């Protein structure tokens, strides 16, 4: 029950790698991340997951389901934002 804002660094685990841990539930609308040795995730549900892009912190994903361990065996799962852009623009310009 941390009262302070926490942070962690975890790489991106290839699709094949995340598949041998979760199964077929993993689709292309998902991104997984985790670091060997880790057994805890800091982000909240719907919490960001930002990567550097030519010098800018860009939202690579959103904390979806299975974000309890964060290990190379049990990498967390995130909504692949990149693949959800076509839907965000639509609403950002139609409302």
């Amino acid at each position: 029950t941390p009262e302070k804002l926490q942070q962690a660094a975890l790489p991106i685990v290839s699709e094949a790698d995340c598949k041998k841990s979760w199964g077929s539930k993993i689709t292309d609308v998902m991104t997984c991340a985790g670091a060997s040795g880790v057994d805890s995730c800091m982000g909240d549900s719907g919490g960001p997951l930002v990567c550097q892009k030519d010098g800018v912190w860009t939202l690579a994903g959103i904390v979806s389901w299975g974000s309890g361990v964060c290990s190379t065996s049990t990498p967390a799962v995130y909504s692949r934002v990149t693949a959800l852009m076509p839907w965000v623009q639509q609403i950002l310009e139609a409302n």
């Binding site: 941390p2 009262e3 302070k4 804002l5 926490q6 942070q7 962690a8 660094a9 975890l10 790489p11 991106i12 685990v13 290839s14 790698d17 539930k25 689709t27 998902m30 991104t31 991340a33 880790v38 057994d39 805890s40 995730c41 800091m42 982000g43 909240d44 549900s45 719907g46 919490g47 960001p48 997951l49 930002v50 990567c51 550097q52 892009k53 800018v56 912190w57 860009t58 939202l59 690579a60 959103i62 904390v63 979806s64 389901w65 974000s67 309890g68 964060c70 967390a76 909504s79 934002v81 990149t82 693949a83 959800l84 852009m85 076509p86 839907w87 965000v88 609403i91 950002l92 409302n95």
Partner: protein
């Protein structure tokens, strides 16, 4: 080491989603001053608020803005069964005043990709719904 405390204001776009009780129940990111991104499994209602520029939910009466939500846009392809397209856009009634401890995060392009092995950061108060 699973993670460490963040320097306040180091992640300006990071908000806290709470309810009429003032209790945090999900995280979200400010992609604009009137638009906030979050997750669908979070189940947000117009009855929920958006706390910005916060760091310690303990005390530290740091200047936090309690934004109000006007609309909620939950992706239509999302179920509690297959949990796909877990994305939700929130429209605030009151917008956020960008500042030193409050700004928005840059979004990528449908053709932008973060290859396997690149290191990224994640922030939060550790509260998940599922």
């Amino acid at each position: 080491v699973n993670g460490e405390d963040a320097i306040p204001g180091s992640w300006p776009w990071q908000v806290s989603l709470q309810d009429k009780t003032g209790f945090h129940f999900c995280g979200g990111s400010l992609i604009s001053e009137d638009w906030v991104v979050t997750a669908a499994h979070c189940g947000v209602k117009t009855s929920d608020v958006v706390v910005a520029g916060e760091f310690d939910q303990g005390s530290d009466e740091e200047n936090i803005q309690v934004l109000k939500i006007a609309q909620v846009f939950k992706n239509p392809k999302f179920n509690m069964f297959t949990v796909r397209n877990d994305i939700t856009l929130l429209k605030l009634a009151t917008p956020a005043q960008f500042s030193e401890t409050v700004s928005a995060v840059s979004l990528p392009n449908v053709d932008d990709d973060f290859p396997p092995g690149t290191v990224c950061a994640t922030t939060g108060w550790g509260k998940t719904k599922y």
